[PDB]
Amino acid sequence: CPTLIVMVGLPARGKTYISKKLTRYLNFIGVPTREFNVGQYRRDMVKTYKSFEFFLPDNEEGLKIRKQCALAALNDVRKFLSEEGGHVAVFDATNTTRERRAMIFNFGEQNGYKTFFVESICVDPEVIAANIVQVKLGSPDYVNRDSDEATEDFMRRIECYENSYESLDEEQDRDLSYIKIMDVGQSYVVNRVADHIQSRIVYYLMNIHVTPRSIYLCRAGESELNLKGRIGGDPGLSPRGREFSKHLAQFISDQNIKDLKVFTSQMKRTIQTAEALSVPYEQFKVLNEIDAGVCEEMTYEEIQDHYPLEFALRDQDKYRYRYPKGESYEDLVQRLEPVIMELERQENVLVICHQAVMRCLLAYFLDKAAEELPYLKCPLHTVLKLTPVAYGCKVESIFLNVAAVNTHRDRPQNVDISRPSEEALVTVPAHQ
Amino acid sequence: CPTLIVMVGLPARGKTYISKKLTRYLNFIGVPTREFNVGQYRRDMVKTYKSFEFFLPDNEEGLKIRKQCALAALNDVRKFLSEEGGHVAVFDATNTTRERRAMIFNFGEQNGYKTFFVESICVDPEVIAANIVQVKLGSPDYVNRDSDEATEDFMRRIECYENSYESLDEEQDRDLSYIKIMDVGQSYVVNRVADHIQSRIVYYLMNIHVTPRSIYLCRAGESELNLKGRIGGDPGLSPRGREFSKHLAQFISDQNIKDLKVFTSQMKRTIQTAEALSVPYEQFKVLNEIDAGVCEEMTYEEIQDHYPLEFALRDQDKYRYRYPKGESYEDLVQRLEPVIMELERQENVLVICHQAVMRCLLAYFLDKAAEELPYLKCPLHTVLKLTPVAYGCKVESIFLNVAAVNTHRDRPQNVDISRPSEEALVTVPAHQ
Ligand SMILES: Nc1ncnc2c1ncn2[C@@H]1O[C@H](COP(=O)(O)OP(=O)(O)NP(=O)(O)O)[C@@H](O)[C@H]1O
Ligand SMILES: CCCCCCCCO[C@@H]1O[C@H](CO)[C@@H](O)[C@H](O)[C@H]1O
Ligand SMILES: CCCCCCCCO[C@@H]1O[C@H](CO)[C@@H](O)[C@H](O)[C@H]1O
Ligand SMILES: CCCCCCCCO[C@@H]1O[C@H](CO)[C@@H](O)[C@H](O)[C@H]1O
Ligand SMILES: O=P(O)(O)OC[C@H]1O[C@](O)(CO)[C@@H](O)[C@@H]1O
Numbered sequence: 001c002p003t004l005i006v007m008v009g010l011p012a013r014g015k016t017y018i019s020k021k022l023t024r025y026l027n028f029i030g031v032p033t034r035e036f037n038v039g040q041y042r043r044d045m046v047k048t049y050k051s052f053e054f055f056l057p058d059n060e061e062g063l064k065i066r067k068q069c070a071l072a073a074l075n076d077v078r079k080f081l082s083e084e085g086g087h088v089a090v091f092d093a094t095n096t097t098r099e100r101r102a103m104i105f106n107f108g109e110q111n112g113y114k115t116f117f118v119e120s121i122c123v124d125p126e127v128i129a130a131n132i133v134q135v136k137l138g139s140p141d142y143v144n145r146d147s148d149e150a151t152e153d154f155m156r157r158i159e160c161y162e163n164s165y166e167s168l169d170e171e172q173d174r175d176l177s178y179i180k181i182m183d184v185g186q187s188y189v190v191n192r193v194a195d196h197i198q199s200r201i202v203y204y205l206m207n208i209h210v211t212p213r214s215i216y217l218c219r220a221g222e223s224e225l226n227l228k229g230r231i232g233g234d235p236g237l238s239p240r241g242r243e244f245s246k247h248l249a250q251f252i253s254d255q256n257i258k259d260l261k262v263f264t265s266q267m268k269r270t271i272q273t274a275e276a277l278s279v280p281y282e283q284f285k286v287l288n289e290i291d292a293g294v295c296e297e298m299t300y301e302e303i304q305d306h307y308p309l310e311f312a313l314r315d316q317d318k319y320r321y322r323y324p325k326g327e328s329y330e331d332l333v334q335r336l337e338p339v340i341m342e343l344e345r346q347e348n349v350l351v352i353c354h355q356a357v358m359r360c361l362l363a364y365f366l367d368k369a370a371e372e373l374p375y376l377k378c379p380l381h382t383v384l385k386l387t388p389v390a391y392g393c394k395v396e397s398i399f400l401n402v403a404a405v406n407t408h409r410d411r412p413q414n415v416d417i418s419r420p421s422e423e424a425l426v427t428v429p430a431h432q
Numbered sequence: 433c434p435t436l437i438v439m440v441g442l443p444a445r446g447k448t449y450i451s452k453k454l455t456r457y458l459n460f461i462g463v464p465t466r467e468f469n470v471g472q473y474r475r476d477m478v479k480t481y482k483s484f485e486f487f488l489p490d491n492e493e494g495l496k497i498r499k500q501c502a503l504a505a506l507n508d509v510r511k512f513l514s515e516e517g518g519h520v521a522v523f524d525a526t527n528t529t530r531e532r533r534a535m536i537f538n539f540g541e542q543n544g545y546k547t548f549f550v551e552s553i554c555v556d557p558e559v560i561a562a563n564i565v566q567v568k569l570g571s572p573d574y575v576n577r578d579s580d581e582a583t584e585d586f587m588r589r590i591e592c593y594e595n596s597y598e599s600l601d602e603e604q605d606r607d608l609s610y611i612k613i614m615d616v617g618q619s620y621v622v623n624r625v626a627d628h629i630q631s632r633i634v635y636y637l638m639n640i641h642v643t644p645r646s647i648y649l650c651r652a653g654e655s656e657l658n659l660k661g662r663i664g665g666d667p668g669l670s671p672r673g674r675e676f677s678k679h680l681a682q683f684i685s686d687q688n689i690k691d692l693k694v695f696t697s698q699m700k701r702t703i704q705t706a707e708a709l710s711v712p713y714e715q716f717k718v719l720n721e722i723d724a725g726v727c728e729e730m731t732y733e734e735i736q737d738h739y740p741l742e743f744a745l746r747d748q749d750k751y752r753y754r755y756p757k758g759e760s761y762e763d764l765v766q767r768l769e770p771v772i773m774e775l776e777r778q779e780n781v782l783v784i785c786h787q788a789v790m791r792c793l794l795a796y797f798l799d800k801a802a803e804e805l806p807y808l809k810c811p812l813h814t815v816l817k818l819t820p821v822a823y824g825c826k827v828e829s830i831f832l833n834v835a836a837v838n839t840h841r842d843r844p845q846n847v848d849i850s851r852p853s854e855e856a857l858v859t860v861p862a863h864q
């Protein structure tokens with residue numbers, strides 16, 4: 001049974017924000033998910049600016065168009081889940097009345113889906129008025145609109161909804177599976193989680209927040225095997241590596257951060273790097289570098305020479321193919337699900353890790369496709385600072401002023417199985 | 433910061449049941465946890481039978497003894513978290529008033545703990561009458577007590593609480609971190625989860641239930657390597673394993689179970705065993721047998737001969753010591769946490785797995801210590817039926833009438849490092 005997640009809530013309550021986060025997360029863990037924004041359907045259709053009058057519960061051309069757009073989107077939900085093999089569809093609309101929700105529920109019922117509701121009720125001033133100055137900012141609806149008039153219009157638009165707004169009821173909606181999220185995550189009300197996927201969605205939703213904070217990601221300092229062009233293993237830091245540790249520690253202080261939690265893997269290179277900090281760290285084996293299996297501690301020349309076909313295949317699909325007894329980047333992603341969860345839940349946090357692991361975490365916060373993830377640039381002695389914002393995440397690359405080797409191998413233009421060794425290793429960075 | 437879980441609710445609301453499941457779960461995942469039942473403190477202090485009068489709001493003698501039992505328990509909570517190195521303490525008492533909960537909360541505050549409340553609510557009388565028949569049955573309080581009088585007395589005891597009962601309020605208790613469980617876990621209210629452990633506790637509590645059902649555990653049938661006395665690998669079924677598959681299918685039918693979900697690992701022996709039932713199934717790599725690393729596909733004789741230091745060590749701490757590039761039973765336990773979660777969430781379920789995995793799962797439901805876990809007996813072609821009950825889990829061993837080899841190796845009396853090889857392999861079951 002595919003799942004139909006139905007957003008419920010007044011405009012500017014974070015329904016879309018939640019819809020995007022949930023959709024991105026689900027896709028990241030490999031569940032084909034797609035969001036359907038009814039407002040976008042409405043914009044892409046009328047093409048002409050509309051005032052709040054169009055949202056009035058008595059307007060004809062308005063109620064007509066809005067219901068048609070809801071049906072258009074629902075038709076695409078049907079196609080995605082029933083025809084394209086999608087697993088979860090997120091239907092982003094106010095859906096503030098029991099009749100509309102009953103309508104949508106029956107739709108799901110008839111098409112063989114399981115419906116689950118997600119209501120967002122924001123009440124805190126620094127959220128409502130806070131989302132407006134983002135609606136008023138990035139919304140196509142208020143482009144080239146006088147500030148005071150746009151702000152006023154939107155307020156009357158929310159009013160068009162408050163008047164008939166029927167929030168999910170403990171008794172009247174006992175039989176529905178849903179979650180009510182208050183004040184962007186302070187409290188929650190959960191009812192009738194029907195299955196495994198819903199239990200995971202709930203778990204995720206109850207762990208995200210919008211508290212300002214930053215996520216710092218960096219690899220351990222250059223190690224002995226980084227110098228030799230060797231992958232995997234458990235080397236200690238190189239001299240220049242220890243030098244970086246000292247630089248990270250300074251950077252961290254200069255940053256002046258409220259309650260920084262530091263995490264490292266169980267590999268010496270990260271722990272050693274962490275020892276330079278003042279703050280105590282927490283080591284987790286789940287953060288360990290991607291296992292190369294049989295190709296552990298080898299160089300690329302050695303892999304090509306010993307495992308020539310697997311090297312070519314990995315080059316063809318670096319996301320899905322693994323070395324013998326090793327992991328794929330796909331595997332790594334499954335392994336890091338608990339890290340993604342904790343990072344969502346954390347506030348200010350520094351993660352000292354490795355190249356593959358760091359690519360995965362960066363792909364998550366910057367929403368990079370699986371195919372592009374195994375190739376993201378995560379240089380040594382460089383600190384990636386991630387600051388979550390509305391719909392996105394700002395990234396700042398901060399080189400900590402200490403040279404280091406290039407462990408980054410681009411994909412060669414020739415990824416053929418029959419290719420010669422020269423072309424296979426032409427992108428291999430200089431080492432030793 | 434150790435955590436202080438404070439149970440809240442009227443008598444016969446499942447506070448204790450929840451306290452024991454939560455305590456067992458937390459310990460299983462390696463978080464030193466201890467529950468403190470205030471009623472047991474009361475029973476041990478007084479020794480003599482007490483009518484409802486003893487619990488009266490005005491009974492001066494009883495108000496005092498109950499106050500001495502509450503503080504006694506709290507002093508032990510303090511000793512455990514602050515002196516014994518415990519991580520989580522579950523304070524099991526009614527704690528039905530705002531003023532009481534604030535006293536407890538201050539205690540936690542002063543001792544450097546984080547307080548989290550778990551309220552269990554039940555306003556359904558058949559459920560209460562059903563529960564009482566467990567209180568009236570297993571409670572030391574109503575031993576040798578006339579049924580109608582016991583039942584009556586307990587009802588008046590609940591009233592001693594209902595009258596002053598102030599449930600956790602959305603507004604009044606806005607600053608408290610808590611979870612309210614309603615309709616025996618149908619709905620929930622969660623407020624201010626403060627950290628990672630609370631987030632995991634919430635996740636766990638929202639996924640357990642008391643819907644009657646059974647958990648069936650059995651290994652895959654005898655395999656080619658079982659015959660050879662070889663551990664690990666990915667062998668197929670032996671002629672007997674196939675025969676068992678045919679026996680398990682029959683047993684499953686004879687059982688006449690409602691909606692049986694079947695799970696297997698990604699190893700052929702389990703899948704092949706599953707292929708013989710009348711119902712479909714799902715496979716999971718998380719269920720794969722414990723990784724022996726370098727000692728994969730080896731025999732015990734071979735392990736003693738090639739890695740003597742490790743066979744002796746693993747023999748010393750079979751829970752914590754691992755083979756090189758392999759897992760420890762401790763690691764397996766961590767790996768199976770998502771399996772524990774799902775099994776709790778499931779109703780009627782059959783898991784076709786392996787020896788080490790089945791030991792871990794059996795240790796969870798039967799609450800066997802980590803030190804005893806790596807040694808539980810899980811014979812081939814033998815089905816272990818687990819039926820969860822109040823505070824425990826009933827276990828029925830069902831041999832499916834098909835002979836098989838012994839893969840069970842008792843801990844040899846000599847586990848001394850540098851021990852003679854004949855003593856090291858004396859408990860090795862005959863094979864080939
Ligand atoms: N969420 C729940 N709601 C209702 N009953 C439950 C819940 N969880 C467990 N039970 C049942 O409650 C019974 C166990 O009750 P018990 O734990 O003795 O209650 P209690 O609140 O600790 N009473 P007391 O110790 O007398 O104050 C069993 O029959 C369980 O199946
Ligand atoms: C940290 C110290 C906790 C003090 C616990 C006070 C125990 C008094 O017991 C009280 O009994 C009353 C009727 O008998 C009930 O109504 C109250 O809920 C209960 O708290
Ligand atoms: C930087 C990332 C920090 C990760 C914090 C990990 C907290 C506990 O990690 C836990 O490990 C268990 C098995 O080991 C898994 O089953 C759980 O899903 C995972 O949360
Ligand atoms: C003993 C059998 C229990 C099997 C447990 C299966 C665990 C589910 O495994 C995976 O977990 C991921 C975590 O979010 C989900 O996203 C995936 O959909 C799910 O398949
Ligand atoms: O996937 P790629 O690009 O080969 O990079 C991964 C390698 O990078 C390293 O982190 C160091 O170069 C190795 O541990 C790892 O195998």
Ligand SMILES: O=P(O)(O)OC[C@H]1O[C@](O)(CO)[C@@H](O)[C@@H]1O
Pocket residue numbers: 658662663664665721722724786787788806839841
């Ligand atoms: O951990 P123990 O008791 O030595 O035995 C576990 C072994 O049992 C088996 O399941 C079969 O003998 C192996 O796969 C596994 O390695």
Ligand SMILES: [Mg+2]
Pocket residue numbers: 447448524525526
């Ligand atoms: Mg109790």
